Amino acid sequence: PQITLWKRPLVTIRIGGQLKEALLNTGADDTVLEEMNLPGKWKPKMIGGIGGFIKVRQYDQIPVEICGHKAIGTVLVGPTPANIIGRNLLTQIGCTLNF
Amino acid sequence: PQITLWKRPLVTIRIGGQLKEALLNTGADDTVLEEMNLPGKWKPKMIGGIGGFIKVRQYDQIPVEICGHKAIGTVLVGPTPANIIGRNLLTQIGCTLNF
Numbered sequence: 001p002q003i004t005l006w007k008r009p010l011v012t013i014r015i016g017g018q019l020k021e022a023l024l025n026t027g028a029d030d031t032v033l034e035e036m037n038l039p040g041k042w043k044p045k046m047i048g049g050i051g052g053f054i055k056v057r058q059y060d061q062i063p064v065e066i067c068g069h070k071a072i073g074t075v076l077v078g079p080t081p082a083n084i085i086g087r088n089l090l091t092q093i094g095c096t097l098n099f
Numbered sequence: 100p101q102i103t104l105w106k107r108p109l110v111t112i113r114i115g116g117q118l119k120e121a122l123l124n125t126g127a128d129d130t131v132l133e134e135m136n137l138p139g140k141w142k143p144k145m146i147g148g149i150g151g152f153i154k155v156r157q158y159d160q161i162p163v164e165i166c167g168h169k170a171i172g173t174v175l176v177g178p179t180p181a182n183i184i185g186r187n188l189l190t191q192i193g194c195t196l197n198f
């Protein structure tokens with residue numbers, strides 16, 4: 001698809017076999033998801049948002065399906081009020097900024 | 100311009116009379132720039148995200164130059180760890196996501 005920015009670019013993502021609504025975010029390297037248990041090893045991380053930093057768990061090689069598109073990559077799980085799909089996965093699904 | 104997402108989508112913006120780098124951010128409802136002086140009035144405001152919210156000055160109908168593209172809109176000024184160009188202005192310059 002080709003999403004416009006008049007409204008927040010929200011889409012459906014599937015991960016761990018669970019379906020979630022996410023926001024496409026060119027403004028961030030990594031992808032952050034709302035708390036949700038996931039399998040695998042994981043290292044602790046600290047990431048800074050607009051109002052400060054939050055602690056997250058970084059999982060690697062996690063398959064995440066975005067709007068029908070396949071992606072496998074590093075996912076950060078933690079206190080975020082919104083599942084934000086970052087650049088790495090964006091490029092994985094062939095997303096670009098056009099103007 | 101076709102922007103890949105493999106790297107930060109930074110672009111030069113000319114505002115007021117200053118030319119600085121800002122991120123084309125589709126994960127932001129608003130445009131936020133780092134502390135600076137701007138002419139005009141302004142109502143205080145609190146914008147938030149990961150880590151919480153921050154205090155910013157809201158200026159409206161502010162001229163902004165983003166890659167030979169002229170836009171006139173709302174510009175929040177304050178303690179942002181990054182110069183952000185949000186959807187309010189991205190749409191103005193006719194920008195979309197495609198994949």
Ligand SMILES: CC(C)c1nc(CN(C)C(=O)N[C@H](C(=O)N[C@@H](Cc2ccccc2)C[C@H](O)[C@H](Cc2ccccc2)NC(=O)OCc2cncs2)C(C)C)cs1
Pocket residue numbers: 008023025026027028029030031032047048049050080081082084086124126127128129131146147148149180181183185
């Ligand atoms: C509540 C929820 C349903 C929503 N609210 C909104 C509206 N809001 C609040 C925003 O758009 N808020 C913006 C914002 O921070 N957007 C964010 C997405 C988000 C939205 C809501 C809650 C948490 C994260 C997305 C933005 O690209 C910012 C920009 C940025 C860059 C460097 C330093 C700080 C910030 N990115 C991050 O906060 O990235 C965190 C990281 C990810 N991986 C590593 S750090 C502000 C800049 C204005 C959209 S969805």
